[PDB]
């Protein structure tokens, strides 16, 4: 039934947010980016590319409050999807993109790689929840809200997670980062060395096999010069680093 490989970017070629890699900046907002990326993809999938919007990481980061966690100090993916069904999320693109209602306000940075941007630091104060759209944005903040029908956990089962992506689109997941992960360039990541750094929340958008090693296709939010153009592959089928244990998703409401 299920194909040996699947790639959401190939299944939905008219949904450009699936290909897009974000940058959370010097802020611990991975929990929010995993959600809003997967939500942006599912809205485009749900509407067969008639609605293709970047949902605002800023709106979720600043307006969820204690229910999600503590903003730029980290949070909880399951509770971010719940906020999408309760208060909804407005649109907004990348830092200084002037795209959408509330584009990201935290500037980009270099995540364990060399580049022209400033290196990422630990300067994460959560910006204020400003329920106003960017000047000149036509819909009001209320009208630009996109709502979820539901949110739910996917079971810790390889086949259920694949089936969920295959039918409903990309999901949010979470796994434990060990220090050898920071140096990922290519291939299928498997933890071999280094201490535990913390939990990280990402967007899973497919699967495959590389040199006999089954993997998940994952979007990171550390900009494009990290890893494999911003994506990585991680070992699939063994709950490696907990990758199969914290998967969450949800279905958009229409309009």
User: Which residues are near ligand L4F by CB under 6 A?
Assistant: 28, 30-31, 69-70, 73-77, 122, 124, 174, 177, 197-201, 246
Nearer to ligand L4F, 58 or 246 (CB): 246
3-state SS, 49-66, equals CCCCCCECHHHHHHHCHH
Nearer to ligand L4F, 145 or 233 (CB): 233
Nearer to ligand L4F, 122 or 135 (CB): 122
Alpha carbon distance 207, 118 (integer Å)? 33
200 is catalytic: yes
CA distance from start to end of the chain: 32
Nearer to ligand L4F, 66 or 211 (CB): 66
Alpha carbon distance 66, 55 (integer Å)? 21
Least distance to ligand L4F, CB of residue 196, Å: 9
Return the residue matching tokens 């969920």: 164
Least distance to ligand L4F, CB of residue 164, Å: 18
Active-site entry in 30, 63, 68, 241: 30
Active-site entry in 63, 109, 146, 200: 200
Nearer to ligand L4F, 144 or 246 (CB): 246
CB < 8 Å & 24+ apart, contacts of 12-16: 12/41, 12/44, 12/45, 12/49, 12/169, 14/44, 14/49, 14/52, 15/41, 15/44, 15/45, 15/49, 15/52, 16/52
Nearer to ligand L4F, 45 or 94 (CB): 94
Angle between helices 77-86 and 30-46 (to 10 degrees): 50
68 is catalytic: no
30 is catalytic: yes
Q: Residues 180, 191: contact at Cβ < 8 Å?
A: yes
Least distance to ligand L4F, CB of residue 140, Å: 30
Least distance to ligand L4F, CB of residue 77, Å: 6
Q: Residues 34, 22: contact at Cβ < 8 Å?
A: no
Active-site entry in 15, 27, 168, 220: 220
Cα–Cα separations (whole angstroms), residue 65 to 23, 68, 74, 157 = 21, 6, 12, 31
Least distance to ligand L4F, CB of residue 211, Å: 27
Q: SS3 of 5, please?
A: coil
Query: Residue 132: is it exposed, middle or buried by C-beta count within 10 angstroms (0-12/13-18/19+)?
Result: exposed
Least distance to ligand L4F, CB of residue 72, Å: 6
Instruction: Catalogue the active-site residues.
Output: 30, 200, 220
């Amino acid at each position: 039934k299920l194909p040996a490989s699947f790639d959401a970017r190939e299944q939905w070629p008219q949904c450009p947010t699936i290909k897009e890699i974000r940058d959370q900046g010097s802020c611990g907002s991975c929990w929010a980016f995993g959600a809003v990326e997967a939500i942006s993809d599912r809205i485009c999938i749900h509407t067969n590319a008639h609605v293709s919007v970047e949902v605002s990481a800023e709106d979720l980061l600043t307006c969820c409050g204690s229910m999600c966690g503590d903003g730029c100090n980290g949070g909880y993916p399951a509770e971010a999807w719940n906020f999408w069904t309760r208060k909804g999320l407005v649109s907004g693109g990348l830092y200084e993109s002037h795209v959408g209602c509330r584009p990201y306000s935290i500037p980009p940075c270099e995540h364990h790689v060399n580049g022209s941007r400033p290196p990422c630091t630990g300067e994460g104060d959560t910006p204020k929840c400003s329920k106003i759209c960017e000047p000149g944005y036509s819909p009001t903040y209320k009208q630009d809200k996109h709502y979820g029908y539901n949110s739910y956990s996917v079971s810790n089962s390889e086949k259920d997670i694949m089936a969920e992506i295959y039918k409903n689109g990309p999901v949010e997941g979470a796994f434990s980062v060990y220090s050898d992960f920071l140096l990922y360039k290519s291939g299928v990541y498997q933890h071999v060395t280094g201490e535990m750094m913390g939990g990280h929340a990402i967007r899973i958008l497919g699967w495959g096999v590389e040199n006999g090693t089954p993997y998940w296709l994952v979007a990171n939010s550390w900009n494009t010069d990290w890893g494999d153009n911003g994506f990585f592959k991680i070992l699939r089928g063994q709950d490696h680093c907990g990758i199969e244990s914290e998967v969450v998703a949800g279905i958009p409401r229409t309009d």
